[PDB]
Amino acid sequence: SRLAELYVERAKWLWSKGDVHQALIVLQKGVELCFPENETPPEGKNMLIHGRAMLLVGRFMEETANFESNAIMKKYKDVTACLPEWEDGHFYLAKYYDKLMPMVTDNKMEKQGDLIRYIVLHFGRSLQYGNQFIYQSMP
Amino acid sequence: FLPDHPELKKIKAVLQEYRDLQTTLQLSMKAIQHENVDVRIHALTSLKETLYKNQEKLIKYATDSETVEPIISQLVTVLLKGCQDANSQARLLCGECLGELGAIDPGRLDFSTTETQGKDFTFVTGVEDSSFAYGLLMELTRAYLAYADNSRAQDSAAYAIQELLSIYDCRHQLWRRFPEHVREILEPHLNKKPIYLSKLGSNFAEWSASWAGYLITKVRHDLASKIFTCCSIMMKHDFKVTIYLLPHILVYVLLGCNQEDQQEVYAEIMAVLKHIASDLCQLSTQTVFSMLDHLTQWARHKFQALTVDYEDYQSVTRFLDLIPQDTLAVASFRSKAYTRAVMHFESFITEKKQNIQEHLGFLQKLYAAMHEPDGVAGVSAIRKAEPSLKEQILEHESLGLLRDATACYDRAIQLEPDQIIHYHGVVKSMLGLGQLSTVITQVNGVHANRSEWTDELNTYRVEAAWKLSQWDLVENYLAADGKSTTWSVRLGQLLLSAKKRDITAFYDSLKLVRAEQIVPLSAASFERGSYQRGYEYIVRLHMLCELEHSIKPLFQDSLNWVARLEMTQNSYRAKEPILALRRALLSLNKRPDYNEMVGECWLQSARVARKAGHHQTAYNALLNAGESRLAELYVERAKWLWSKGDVHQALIVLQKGVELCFPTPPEGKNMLIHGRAMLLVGRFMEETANFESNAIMKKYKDVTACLPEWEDGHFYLAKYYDKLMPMVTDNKMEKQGDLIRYIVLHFGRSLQYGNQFIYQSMPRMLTLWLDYGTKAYEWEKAGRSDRVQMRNDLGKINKVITEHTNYLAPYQFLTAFSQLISRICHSHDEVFVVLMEIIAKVFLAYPQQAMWMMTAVSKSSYPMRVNRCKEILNKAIHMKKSLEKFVGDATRLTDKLLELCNKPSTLSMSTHFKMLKKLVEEATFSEILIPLQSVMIPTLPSILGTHANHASHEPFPGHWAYIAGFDDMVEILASLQKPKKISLKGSDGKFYIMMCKPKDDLRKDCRLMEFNSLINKCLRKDAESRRRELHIRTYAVIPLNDECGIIEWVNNTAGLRPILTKLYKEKGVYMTGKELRQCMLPKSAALSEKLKVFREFLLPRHPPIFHEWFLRTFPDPTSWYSSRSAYCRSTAVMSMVGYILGLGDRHGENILFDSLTGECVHVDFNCLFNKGETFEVPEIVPFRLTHNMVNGMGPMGTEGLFRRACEVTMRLMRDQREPLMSVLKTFLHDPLVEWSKHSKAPLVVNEKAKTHVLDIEQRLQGVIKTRNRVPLSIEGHVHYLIQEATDENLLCQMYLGWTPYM
Amino acid sequence: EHLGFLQKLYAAMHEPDGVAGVSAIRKAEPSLKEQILEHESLGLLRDATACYDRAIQLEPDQIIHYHGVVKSMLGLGQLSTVITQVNGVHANRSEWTDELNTYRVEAAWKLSQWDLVENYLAADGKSTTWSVRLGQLLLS
Ligand SMILES: Nc1ncnc2c1ncn2[C@@H]1O[C@H](COP(=O)(O)OP(=O)(O)OP(O)(O)=S)[C@@H](O)[C@H]1O
């Protein structure tokens, strides 16, 4: 595949390796493999793969000691954009939302809420998109 | 004149007119230098004998301190002057002597002092220069003189000799310039090219003769043409003369060029592109490049001036333009120019913008020539384009990861094979970690194929046979024999010779093996620091010398195989070779005990494997060897596996092994090993909540019981105790000292045995004791609980300290005791004051350490400290009448220093005050070595001897300078509160001006200096740091006054800001200081607006000149690459270490780069934890990264593989977390150091500084900390650090500071 | 005393978990062939390759011992490596050439080369050959 494809899977293998810096280098390489600046793919599966790479990047950001929450949200938005339908993009966004929700609360239940409502809507969309993350989303 | 004497009385008769083992060695070092090469060979034979005579004692001279022995340093000088002989035999004898010496760690070697490669430039414009005329005379001498002996050559030679005699008077200033002697007798006797190389030009000399006729016409000057005509007769007479003539002819061609000659120059480039004779043509192209460099030097002289010369420079530029640097790099790749080729490739990228991928394919070839540790893989990481599968296999080789993917390189060969050699590389992968079974299958596959590589595989099989130690394996070696042998295969042949029992005939074969080593040695000769690069090849030669000793035993100094391995610097690749050599030696021995020894050698290899990781490979190595089982040895193999993974699971297996080992009997080391296993269990206990800390303490007591004597067991127990004591308080504090005292007693026992690790731990333990004493004084003032009860614990601790002191060695305390003393002075005094008196006794032991302490005491009002100094002086008077007198002499020297500090182009302050000059003249003050950062550091106690290694070593060991006084007028650098620098003549007579600047504190710099180079000592120890082979510069400041700190100026120091100003001047681009003022930033600048304005101004302000600066720094293309490597050493991990501290923020003007190799320096980085950054503007990048500076370091790619390696080095520094923690605690601890910026405290502290120490621990963690919430990776952190320097916005946030457009 | 029966018992079980328990249970660590049985329970090819190499270094009297190293080559799954192992094996097994040839034939199935298939096809083995005999049917 011209797209990273199995090489993108190799970046997942790098995640299996567990070295974030190597994984980050792989993530940049994967974006490059679809294009130096790849557009979301016209093929739905290729676009979904690009979204999956964005989800992997969000996991990498969570691994990173320093990450931008807005940047993670933008990657999540891009994943949602590649497939509104795909369960994985919504599920990754829901996981990002939960981390965002603890920060939004800032240790206060009252502070959390508008963000929580957006997260709940994303969780419902993710459950509709796929049942595989749906059981976790339902709890 | 002095020579080794057969008869002692004849030497004695010479000796009385001329006027213990080390002195003999000093005579030997003079002996090693030889007036006559034949005389040197006799000396070399004597030197090899002297080393043998030294025997174990020579090893004892070699080992005594962790710091390399000075006597070894004379020996190290002997190695520099050792096997470098034009005669092969002379070099071989020197090499044999080096083998008896064995291989010093490159990190261990301290000889960076010698000027070595650096020298005043040889190049001169020529013809006007006497040396160019001397060079023509040198060309006339030797082969032209041999040509003069031939009659046909002689008529041309005589005409040239007569022309040379007409050109230059034989006399007598010219005669004084001339070597004369036999040459003077010769002087009296004297009184764009297709045709070139191809066809008639043939092997260079014919081409040169055709070129010379064109050149004489081409040169504008009649005199240059006349010189060319004289050269042309000489060029016909000698091919070597023609080559010398061609560089001069090229300079004449540069001075005047015909348009046809310019086409001929293009033709010569085409001939170089078209290019034995081809190697000579490649050498001729290199000579043409060298002539171009000489032309560039002439162009630089033209550039230095301010017309026609500029037009000539433009014509040279046009010739350079006609040449294509990328084509030259491709020719250079054929040339195997390597770093010189890389510089041409870098020039091509500079010359014309290129696709990064297009540059990358050439770069990948360049990386292979470089043999860089990153190699192709570092280039690949820089590359944005995914590697070709063959390129990826090359990248895997560049990684040299080995292990997994060795098969993958074979798999690419499986998909298609174009090279038998590529298959052979797969076969090397098949050998993997020395696997015999894989080799046997490979050998059968190799046999079915017919290839030169298949024969090489048979040679590899012979190496496997050497591992086998099998007579049948020797028969396979015989099958290899009668076929060309690789040098490793030749080593296998030497093993075959051991089976042969050839003896002296085998030794002659060994001499042939030595000759192959000599070819490596010819590769070894090079610019300074080449020896560290060639040290591994030298180690293979050292292994051959050990094999020769083994051969002598078979035919039948201490030469322990283990001792030789310890002396050698240790690297994971180096260890694997050393283990193979040790295995071979065990294999050669037929002893059953030798077979048990071979298993022990495999175990030693396993310890090397633990250093090399590759734990599965190491387990494979244990399987490959095994037998001679040791319960501790099996446990150690399990422990290395445990460290890689499942350490607790391995520990449970280790406990079962311990049960097998012990039902009793210590059994020597094995009982100590059982204690070590208990220490590993204690680490496991810390790891597991189920493991009980009190139980672990009981285990620690048991480990102490197994060996009372071992320092390590006590030290480990003390470290466990210290963690336990903090845990027992659980932040309770309050009562703590009695528990701390039990931990201190374990630390003291560990200190009494002594350890290299122990000395760092002991300083931390002493610091903890000092903190406890301060706490007790505070408690007594508080009245909290019982002041007396706290005092009683403190008194018991003081009594323990006195007992510890008797065990303690002042040399063993070394630098740490002095650093502790500035922190040590306290208002409470009393028992702490008594501890200070013990510190004073250590101060008495080294005068220089006391002198440094005195200067700090002088700056402080130190009314209590001066009284303590007076008590120390009374102790010094008790120690010697002279010791008290020396302190008075030191005080007088300090007063002279104070006058220099006041500093009321070059100013004659010494002329201005008679007393300061008189004091310098007076010998009454004790002679003082000029302060050095190295001089300040104490010589390390030897790792090999736990106790008294420091005592045998100088507590600090260096040649000691005696002040010669200072010149009456010394030029002083001018600045507000400017430091004034004057140089005292050295006992050596080298003089360095040292300048003390108001608003600069020498003591604060000294505390930074003391932390500095702790890593450098660690780097010499680290294999990776040795692979970097990069020194870390240490600033030295010795000014007693707090207000002014005086540091001798570094030679070749360049301000980064000053260099940038010079670069702007070289560009001729002009930016007004007022124009920079004209650019305006709102204090509340929009972050986007400020960055956008900054970027536009920056791009115009600083097109990068860094690459040009690097080219100026080294003339050689290879030399420039070495300077680039020095730049890679510069900043990088050292910049990262400052970033991890968070303290520095050095001004770009403050930063200094050495002129010869460019080395990064940080000056007056007062801010700690970015206190300065917090003030005013704050800069995100940990280390300033000017874009132009980054581009010059980058060459083709700004990002540095060496910089990535530096981040790994920083991770190694993180690995020594405890040493770093002790240093951080010390910086806060010293009274002279200010945690938060001594009349106030005759006997600073920052709450933020304590938080900063927690931040430093966070830096060791590598956790971002700044990011909200939040998982730390050192490699990711290094990438983040590169990103922080990279961002324009981070530059926008910074105000002033580097203030650099690029 | 029970362990010797147990090692046989573990083999009958053909269960890794039972084998792992036996290894923990034994007072003395398994070595050589006993270590090799432990390696099969461990399931790690690199350890197995080392174990096979160590066993070969002590002695090389077993075609099966060579076969276990070949199994490690199968774990490597590199066609060039598998061929290299096969060539070495054919010379080494003068008594039983091609005993691991069927293993090589499975490698040939991995090779997916008809000519590679032909060399295996030329070889004749009185064995079921497991999947590889099916591969021989695949070969035409
Ligand atoms: N080897 C050296 N030669 C000359 N000046 C030096 C050297 N090392 C440090 N300096 C400092 O250079 C200063 C002269 O001004 P610059 O070269 O612009 O640097 P600076 O920023 O003032 O340097 P500091 O004082 O070290 S922050 C003096 O204040 C010196 O302290």
From Swiss-Prot, chain C:
It comes from the Eukaryota. Ubiquitous, with highest expression in testis. It is found in: Nucleus; Chromosome; Nucleus envelope. Phosphorylated. It is linked to Seckel syndrome 1: A rare autosomal recessive disorder characterized by proportionate dwarfism of prenatal onset associated with low birth weight, growth retardation, severe microcephaly with a bird-headed like appearance, and intellectual disability. Belongs to the PI3/PI4-kinase family. ATM subfamily. Forms a heterodimer with ATRIP, forming the ATR-ATRIP complex. Present in a complex containing ATRIP and RPA-coated single-stranded DNA. Binds to DNA, and to UV-damaged DNA with higher affinity. Interacts with MSH2 and HDAC2. Present in a complex containing CHD4 and HDAC2. Interacts with EEF1E1, the interaction is enhanced by UV irradiation. Interacts with CLSPN and CEP164. Interacts with TELO2 and TTI1. Interacts with BCR-ABL after genotoxic stress. Interacts with UHRF2; this interaction promotes ATR activation. Serine/threonine protein kinase which activates checkpoint signaling upon genotoxic stresses such as ionizing radiation (IR), ultraviolet light (UV), or DNA replication stalling, thereby acting as a DNA damage sensor. Recognizes the substrate consensus sequence [ST]-Q. Phosphorylates BRCA1, CHEK1, MCM2, RAD17, RBBP8, RPA2, SMC1 and p53/TP53, which collectively inhibit DNA replication and mitosis and promote DNA repair, recombination and apoptosis. Phosphorylates 'Ser-139' of histone variant H2AX at sites of DNA damage, thereby regulating DNA damage response mechanism. This is Serine/threonine-protein kinase ATR. It comes from Homo sapiens (Human). The gene is ATR. The chain holds residues 1671 to 1810 of 2644 of the full protein.
